[PDB]
Design an enzyme around this catalytic site. Structure first.
Site, PDB file in Angstrom:
ATOM      1  N   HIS A  61       0.879  -1.191   0.000  1.00  0.00           N
ATOM      2  CA  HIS A  61       0.000   0.000   0.000  1.00  0.00           C
ATOM      3  C   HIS A  61       0.897   1.215   0.000  1.00  0.00           C
ATOM      4  CE1 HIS A  61      -2.371  -3.254   2.150  1.00  0.00           C
ATOM      5  NE2 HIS A  61      -3.113  -2.980   1.087  1.00  0.00           N
ATOM      6  N   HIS A  91       5.030   7.105   7.164  1.00  0.00           N
ATOM      7  CA  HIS A  91       4.768   6.708   5.790  1.00  0.00           C
ATOM      8  C   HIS A  91       4.218   7.909   5.034  1.00  0.00           C
ATOM      9  CE1 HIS A  91       0.919   6.269   7.920  1.00  0.00           C
ATOM     10  NE2 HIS A  91       0.376   6.652   6.768  1.00  0.00           N
ATOM     11  N   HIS A  93       1.498   9.214   1.580  1.00  0.00           N
ATOM     12  CA  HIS A  93       0.502   8.987   0.565  1.00  0.00           C
ATOM     13  C   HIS A  93       0.835   9.983  -0.589  1.00  0.00           C
ATOM     14  CE1 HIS A  93      -2.209   6.978   3.575  1.00  0.00           C
ATOM     15  NE2 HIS A  93      -1.531   7.749   4.428  1.00  0.00           N
ATOM     16  N   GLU A 103      -3.977  13.542   1.278  1.00  0.00           N
ATOM     17  CA  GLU A 103      -5.294  13.048   1.846  1.00  0.00           C
ATOM     18  C   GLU A 103      -6.051  14.227   2.427  1.00  0.00           C
ATOM     19  OE1 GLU A 103      -4.135   9.521   4.176  1.00  0.00           O
ATOM     20  OE2 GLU A 103      -4.942   8.535   2.407  1.00  0.00           O
ATOM     21  N   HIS A 116       2.780  11.105   7.119  1.00  0.00           N
ATOM     22  CA  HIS A 116       2.119  10.800   8.370  1.00  0.00           C
ATOM     23  C   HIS A 116       3.135  10.183   9.293  1.00  0.00           C
ATOM     24  CE1 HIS A 116      -1.992  10.455   6.203  1.00  0.00           C
ATOM     25  NE2 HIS A 116      -1.606  11.708   6.401  1.00  0.00           N
ATOM     26  N   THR A 195      -6.523   6.536   7.875  1.00  0.00           N
ATOM     27  CA  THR A 195      -7.105   6.735   6.505  1.00  0.00           C
ATOM     28  C   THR A 195      -6.945   5.466   5.646  1.00  0.00           C
ATOM     29  OG1 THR A 195      -4.986   7.462   5.598  1.00  0.00           O
ATOM     30  CG2 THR A 195      -6.364   9.132   6.656  1.00  0.00           C
ATOM     31  N   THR A 196      -6.438   4.405   6.288  1.00  0.00           N
ATOM     32  CA  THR A 196      -6.352   3.104   5.618  1.00  0.00           C
ATOM     33  C   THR A 196      -7.101   2.107   6.473  1.00  0.00           C
ATOM     34  OG1 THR A 196      -4.269   2.817   6.862  1.00  0.00           O
ATOM     35  CG2 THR A 196      -4.088   3.518   4.629  1.00  0.00           C
TER      36      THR A 196
END
Ligand SMILES: Cc1cccc(=S)n1O
Ligand code: NA
Ligand SMILES: [Zn+2]
Length: 257
Positions: A61, A91, A93, A103, A116, A195-196
């Protein structure tokens, strides 16, 4: 299983994770005109001098930079927080193109990526017990824009070739996450979620107002990662962001005037 494509992307997640349609989901659009300054907020304290990174992992991911969280070594406190939160991983996004990838959004503006830094409340003893609590996590969110390179990011970029595909990991010791921070710690804060999947509603979000700049070459290297595992058809790891969710009955507070 879950992912970011047409058939297993964010609009599907609610079927396996019904909390996807919950009351405090993340991310959200930050309406800067509606977010009220709160003079009772404190400066954020970010104490990363003793942070011990261990490893980087491609989880199919995103990639996670993991830390030794067995002692109080890298902590976030102050800001909107009661108590002490220990860094466990960071991590990002990001998008396929520089016009999308974050996000959270700011007045509907999407940044190229979002970092994040994930921290857990030490009053709950471990990360697994913290994600069963409404105040278990604090996530420091930092926007990325494309422009000048971020020197402090380059060690992460250069290791990505070694973790191209899902399930690969690499030693990643002695990385200093202070090199990822902007100058200002001015922020917005609200109660939200991962958010995952599993989308748990445990997170005090602390979103910095000042983005960091990364170079187009740095973000292009993120986009050469793969969601698939070794020996599987290549699916580039891009667009691993969830769009903004309903604010519902929440207020976004600003630490600054
Ligand atoms: C794994 C994780 C923890 C906290 C926040 C977010 S967005 N993720 O993905
Ligand atoms: Na650990
Ligand atoms: Zn995240």
């Amino acid at each position: 299983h879950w992912g970011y494509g047409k058939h297993n992307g964010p609009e599907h997640w609610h079927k396996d994770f019904p909390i996807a349609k919950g009351e405090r989901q993340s991310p959200v659009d930050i309406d800067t005109h509606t977010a009220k300054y709160d003079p009772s907020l404190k400066p954020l304290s970010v104490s990363y001098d003793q942070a011990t990174s261990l490893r980087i992992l491609n989880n199919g991911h995103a990639f996670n930079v993991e830390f030794d969280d067995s002692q109080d070594k890298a902590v976030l406190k102050g800001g909107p927080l009661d108590g002490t939160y220990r860094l466990i991983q960071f991590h990002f996004h990001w998008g396929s193109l520089d016009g999308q990838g974050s996000e959270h959004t700011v007045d509907k503006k999407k940044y190229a990526a979002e970092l994040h830094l994930v921290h857990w409340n030490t009053k709950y003893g471990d990360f697994g017990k913290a994600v069963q609590q409404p105040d278990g996590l604090a996530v420091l969110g930092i926007f990325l824009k494309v422009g000048s390179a971020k020197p402090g990011l380059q060690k992460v970029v250069d290791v990505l070739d070694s973790i191209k595909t899902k399930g690969k990991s690499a030693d990643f010791t002695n990385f200093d996450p202070r090199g990822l921070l902007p100058e200002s710690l001015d922020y917005w804060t609200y109660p939200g979620s991962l958010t995952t999947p599993p989308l748990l509603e445990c997170v005090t979000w602390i979103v910095l107002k000042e983005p960091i700049s990364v170079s187009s070459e740095q973000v292009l290297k993120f986009r050469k990662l793969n969601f698939n595992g070794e020996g599987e058809p290549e699916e580039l790891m891009v667009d691993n962001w969830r769009p903004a969710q309903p604010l519902k009955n929440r207020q976004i507070k600003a630490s600054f005037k």
